[PDB]
mmCIF file with all atom_site columns, C-alpha atoms in Angstrom:
data_model
loop_
_atom_site.group_PDB
_atom_site.id
_atom_site.type_symbol
_atom_site.label_atom_id
_atom_site.label_alt_id
_atom_site.label_comp_id
_atom_site.label_asym_id
_atom_site.label_entity_id
_atom_site.label_seq_id
_atom_site.pdbx_PDB_ins_code
_atom_site.Cartn_x
_atom_site.Cartn_y
_atom_site.Cartn_z
_atom_site.occupancy
_atom_site.B_iso_or_equiv
_atom_site.pdbx_formal_charge
_atom_site.auth_seq_id
_atom_site.auth_comp_id
_atom_site.auth_asym_id
_atom_site.auth_atom_id
_atom_site.pdbx_PDB_model_num
ATOM 1   C CA . UNK A 1 1   ? -46.422 2.707   30.180 1.00 42.23 ? 39  UNK A CA 1
ATOM 2   C CA . UNK A 1 2   ? -43.030 3.176   31.989 1.00 41.22 ? 40  UNK A CA 1
ATOM 3   C CA . UNK A 1 3   ? -40.727 1.269   29.464 1.00 40.80 ? 41  UNK A CA 1
ATOM 4   C CA . UNK A 1 4   ? -41.139 4.216   26.970 1.00 40.71 ? 42  UNK A CA 1
ATOM 5   C CA . UNK A 1 5   ? -39.823 6.668   29.638 1.00 38.04 ? 43  UNK A CA 1
ATOM 6   C CA . UNK A 1 6   ? -36.767 4.736   31.125 1.00 34.44 ? 44  UNK A CA 1
ATOM 7   C CA . UNK A 1 7   ? -35.782 3.943   27.466 1.00 36.08 ? 45  UNK A CA 1
ATOM 8   C CA . UNK A 1 8   ? -35.689 7.624   26.319 1.00 33.13 ? 46  UNK A CA 1
ATOM 9   C CA . UNK A 1 9   ? -34.299 8.540   29.792 1.00 30.82 ? 47  UNK A CA 1
ATOM 10  C CA . UNK A 1 10  ? -31.290 6.290   28.962 1.00 31.37 ? 48  UNK A CA 1
ATOM 11  C CA . UNK A 1 11  ? -30.862 8.054   25.500 1.00 32.12 ? 49  UNK A CA 1
ATOM 12  C CA . UNK A 1 12  ? -30.532 11.432  27.329 1.00 34.62 ? 50  UNK A CA 1
ATOM 13  C CA . UNK A 1 13  ? -28.877 10.322  30.653 1.00 32.97 ? 51  UNK A CA 1
ATOM 14  C CA . UNK A 1 14  ? -25.330 11.449  29.526 1.00 33.40 ? 52  UNK A CA 1
ATOM 15  C CA . UNK A 1 15  ? -25.976 13.896  26.593 1.00 35.54 ? 53  UNK A CA 1
ATOM 16  C CA . UNK A 1 16  ? -25.092 12.990  22.949 1.00 35.05 ? 54  UNK A CA 1
ATOM 17  C CA . UNK A 1 17  ? -21.319 13.688  23.572 1.00 35.52 ? 55  UNK A CA 1
ATOM 18  C CA . UNK A 1 18  ? -20.799 10.303  25.390 1.00 33.52 ? 56  UNK A CA 1
ATOM 19  C CA . UNK A 1 19  ? -22.606 8.498   22.458 1.00 34.90 ? 57  UNK A CA 1
ATOM 20  C CA . UNK A 1 20  ? -19.446 9.083   20.274 1.00 31.26 ? 58  UNK A CA 1
ATOM 21  C CA . UNK A 1 21  ? -17.407 6.860   22.685 1.00 31.48 ? 59  UNK A CA 1
ATOM 22  C CA . UNK A 1 22  ? -20.435 4.513   23.082 1.00 30.36 ? 60  UNK A CA 1
ATOM 23  C CA . UNK A 1 23  ? -20.423 3.405   19.362 1.00 31.86 ? 61  UNK A CA 1
ATOM 24  C CA . UNK A 1 24  ? -16.653 2.476   19.474 1.00 31.55 ? 62  UNK A CA 1
ATOM 25  C CA . UNK A 1 25  ? -17.018 -0.091  22.341 1.00 26.60 ? 63  UNK A CA 1
ATOM 26  C CA . UNK A 1 26  ? -20.730 -1.013  21.548 1.00 25.47 ? 64  UNK A CA 1
ATOM 27  C CA . UNK A 1 27  ? -19.741 -1.922  17.910 1.00 24.66 ? 65  UNK A CA 1
ATOM 28  C CA . UNK A 1 28  ? -18.146 -5.161  19.306 1.00 24.30 ? 66  UNK A CA 1
ATOM 29  C CA . UNK A 1 29  ? -21.326 -5.969  21.341 1.00 23.35 ? 67  UNK A CA 1
ATOM 30  C CA . UNK A 1 30  ? -23.711 -5.223  18.383 1.00 24.09 ? 68  UNK A CA 1
ATOM 31  C CA . UNK A 1 31  ? -21.567 -7.598  16.249 1.00 25.66 ? 69  UNK A CA 1
ATOM 32  C CA . UNK A 1 32  ? -22.344 -10.448 18.718 1.00 25.25 ? 70  UNK A CA 1
ATOM 33  C CA . UNK A 1 33  ? -26.105 -9.633  18.700 1.00 22.31 ? 71  UNK A CA 1
ATOM 34  C CA . UNK A 1 34  ? -26.286 -9.939  14.847 1.00 21.73 ? 72  UNK A CA 1
ATOM 35  C CA . UNK A 1 35  ? -23.597 -12.739 14.529 1.00 21.91 ? 73  UNK A CA 1
ATOM 36  C CA . UNK A 1 36  ? -25.702 -14.945 16.898 1.00 21.34 ? 74  UNK A CA 1
ATOM 37  C CA . UNK A 1 37  ? -28.742 -14.754 14.486 1.00 20.62 ? 75  UNK A CA 1
ATOM 38  C CA . UNK A 1 38  ? -26.756 -15.151 11.222 1.00 20.97 ? 76  UNK A CA 1
ATOM 39  C CA . UNK A 1 39  ? -24.666 -18.009 12.774 1.00 21.71 ? 77  UNK A CA 1
ATOM 40  C CA . UNK A 1 40  ? -21.261 -16.900 11.302 1.00 21.85 ? 78  UNK A CA 1
ATOM 41  C CA . UNK A 1 41  ? -17.745 -18.388 11.994 1.00 20.65 ? 79  UNK A CA 1
ATOM 42  C CA . UNK A 1 42  ? -16.969 -16.662 15.367 1.00 21.52 ? 80  UNK A CA 1
ATOM 43  C CA . UNK A 1 43  ? -18.627 -13.874 17.508 1.00 24.46 ? 81  UNK A CA 1
ATOM 44  C CA . UNK A 1 44  ? -15.452 -11.746 18.042 1.00 22.77 ? 82  UNK A CA 1
ATOM 45  C CA . UNK A 1 45  ? -14.573 -12.118 14.279 1.00 20.50 ? 83  UNK A CA 1
ATOM 46  C CA . UNK A 1 46  ? -17.775 -10.385 13.094 1.00 20.61 ? 84  UNK A CA 1
ATOM 47  C CA . UNK A 1 47  ? -17.440 -7.841  15.992 1.00 21.48 ? 85  UNK A CA 1
ATOM 48  C CA . UNK A 1 48  ? -13.871 -6.845  14.825 1.00 22.88 ? 86  UNK A CA 1
ATOM 49  C CA . UNK A 1 49  ? -15.285 -5.848  11.375 1.00 21.82 ? 87  UNK A CA 1
ATOM 50  C CA . UNK A 1 50  ? -17.966 -3.674  13.183 1.00 23.37 ? 88  UNK A CA 1
ATOM 51  C CA . UNK A 1 51  ? -15.219 -1.527  14.928 1.00 20.29 ? 89  UNK A CA 1
ATOM 52  C CA . UNK A 1 52  ? -13.796 -1.161  11.356 1.00 17.15 ? 90  UNK A CA 1
ATOM 53  C CA . UNK A 1 53  ? -17.203 -0.478  9.641  1.00 15.51 ? 91  UNK A CA 1
ATOM 54  C CA . UNK A 1 54  ? -17.004 3.191   10.860 1.00 16.09 ? 92  UNK A CA 1
ATOM 55  C CA . UNK A 1 55  ? -14.290 3.997   8.236  1.00 13.37 ? 93  UNK A CA 1
ATOM 56  C CA . UNK A 1 56  ? -15.766 6.636   5.795  1.00 11.41 ? 94  UNK A CA 1
ATOM 57  C CA . UNK A 1 57  ? -14.745 4.556   2.726  1.00 10.55 ? 95  UNK A CA 1
ATOM 58  C CA . UNK A 1 58  ? -18.321 4.657   1.299  1.00 4.88  ? 96  UNK A CA 1
ATOM 59  C CA . UNK A 1 59  ? -19.586 7.913   2.958  1.00 6.40  ? 97  UNK A CA 1
ATOM 60  C CA . UNK A 1 60  ? -22.196 7.971   5.772  1.00 6.45  ? 98  UNK A CA 1
ATOM 61  C CA . UNK A 1 61  ? -24.226 5.305   7.757  1.00 7.50  ? 99  UNK A CA 1
ATOM 62  C CA . UNK A 1 62  ? -21.042 3.106   7.523  1.00 6.35  ? 100 UNK A CA 1
ATOM 63  C CA . UNK A 1 63  ? -21.747 1.232   10.838 1.00 7.97  ? 101 UNK A CA 1
ATOM 64  C CA . UNK A 1 64  ? -25.596 1.142   10.238 1.00 8.79  ? 102 UNK A CA 1
ATOM 65  C CA . UNK A 1 65  ? -25.544 -0.356  6.667  1.00 10.58 ? 103 UNK A CA 1
ATOM 66  C CA . UNK A 1 66  ? -23.541 -3.329  8.163  1.00 10.04 ? 104 UNK A CA 1
ATOM 67  C CA . UNK A 1 67  ? -26.358 -3.990  10.748 1.00 9.94  ? 105 UNK A CA 1
ATOM 68  C CA . UNK A 1 68  ? -29.097 -3.799  7.948  1.00 9.88  ? 106 UNK A CA 1
ATOM 69  C CA . UNK A 1 69  ? -27.261 -6.296  5.648  1.00 10.90 ? 107 UNK A CA 1
ATOM 70  C CA . UNK A 1 70  ? -27.345 -8.778  8.537  1.00 9.69  ? 108 UNK A CA 1
ATOM 71  C CA . UNK A 1 71  ? -31.055 -7.982  9.291  1.00 9.30  ? 109 UNK A CA 1
ATOM 72  C CA . UNK A 1 72  ? -31.910 -9.320  5.740  1.00 10.86 ? 110 UNK A CA 1
ATOM 73  C CA . UNK A 1 73  ? -29.695 -12.442 6.285  1.00 13.49 ? 111 UNK A CA 1
ATOM 74  C CA . UNK A 1 74  ? -31.410 -13.133 9.666  1.00 12.53 ? 112 UNK A CA 1
ATOM 75  C CA . UNK A 1 75  ? -34.731 -12.295 7.838  1.00 10.68 ? 113 UNK A CA 1
ATOM 76  C CA . UNK A 1 76  ? -35.990 -9.912  10.609 1.00 10.49 ? 114 UNK A CA 1
ATOM 77  C CA . UNK A 1 77  ? -38.612 -7.191  9.955  1.00 11.63 ? 115 UNK A CA 1
ATOM 78  C CA . UNK A 1 78  ? -36.491 -4.040  10.707 1.00 13.81 ? 116 UNK A CA 1
ATOM 79  C CA . UNK A 1 79  ? -35.648 -1.117  8.324  1.00 13.60 ? 117 UNK A CA 1
ATOM 80  C CA . UNK A 1 80  ? -32.607 1.261   8.331  1.00 15.72 ? 118 UNK A CA 1
ATOM 81  C CA . UNK A 1 81  ? -35.081 3.924   9.731  1.00 16.94 ? 119 UNK A CA 1
ATOM 82  C CA . UNK A 1 82  ? -35.501 1.816   12.982 1.00 17.89 ? 120 UNK A CA 1
ATOM 83  C CA . UNK A 1 83  ? -31.797 0.561   13.111 1.00 20.99 ? 121 UNK A CA 1
ATOM 84  C CA . UNK A 1 84  ? -30.368 4.052   13.897 1.00 21.32 ? 122 UNK A CA 1
ATOM 85  C CA . UNK A 1 85  ? -33.152 4.503   16.574 1.00 22.21 ? 123 UNK A CA 1
ATOM 86  C CA . UNK A 1 86  ? -32.290 1.115   18.200 1.00 26.70 ? 124 UNK A CA 1
ATOM 87  C CA . UNK A 1 87  ? -28.557 2.128   18.113 1.00 29.34 ? 125 UNK A CA 1
ATOM 88  C CA . UNK A 1 88  ? -29.249 5.253   20.315 1.00 30.36 ? 126 UNK A CA 1
ATOM 89  C CA . UNK A 1 89  ? -30.842 3.218   23.223 1.00 28.18 ? 127 UNK A CA 1
ATOM 90  C CA . UNK A 1 90  ? -28.432 0.328   22.768 1.00 27.42 ? 128 UNK A CA 1
ATOM 91  C CA . UNK A 1 91  ? -25.548 2.871   23.127 1.00 25.88 ? 129 UNK A CA 1
ATOM 92  C CA . UNK A 1 92  ? -27.154 4.278   26.388 1.00 22.49 ? 130 UNK A CA 1
ATOM 93  C CA . UNK A 1 93  ? -26.530 0.882   28.069 1.00 20.74 ? 131 UNK A CA 1
ATOM 94  C CA . UNK A 1 94  ? -23.051 0.638   26.436 1.00 20.88 ? 132 UNK A CA 1
ATOM 95  C CA . UNK A 1 95  ? -21.937 3.801   28.390 1.00 20.89 ? 133 UNK A CA 1
ATOM 96  C CA . UNK A 1 96  ? -23.426 2.614   31.760 1.00 21.78 ? 134 UNK A CA 1
ATOM 97  C CA . UNK A 1 97  ? -20.265 0.486   32.348 1.00 21.28 ? 135 UNK A CA 1
ATOM 98  C CA . UNK A 1 98  ? -17.947 3.454   31.337 1.00 24.15 ? 136 UNK A CA 1
ATOM 99  C CA . UNK A 1 99  ? -19.859 5.837   33.668 1.00 22.32 ? 137 UNK A CA 1
ATOM 100 C CA . UNK A 1 100 ? -18.269 5.958   37.133 1.00 19.67 ? 138 UNK A CA 1
ATOM 101 C CA . UNK A 1 101 ? -20.909 8.019   39.077 1.00 16.47 ? 139 UNK A CA 1
#
């Protein structure tokens, strides 16, 4: 298969260092993805709490735990193990827009 390659190619197209800026903008966009399945109040309203879920109030996985909580509400078959993995590739697209050349 090719999809396996292009996918991991995205994950390593701009090192890990870009991925730290990726999360910050992508947080909004991930909010929308989960908010759409849970059918909350507003898309941007759940997204605003994602760009605040990175605060180390509780410790680690602060953004990720938020995503999982919603995955139970939506009743999808995805564990915390897979969430972090999905986040990497999802972030690789989130930096494509930021990347000039």
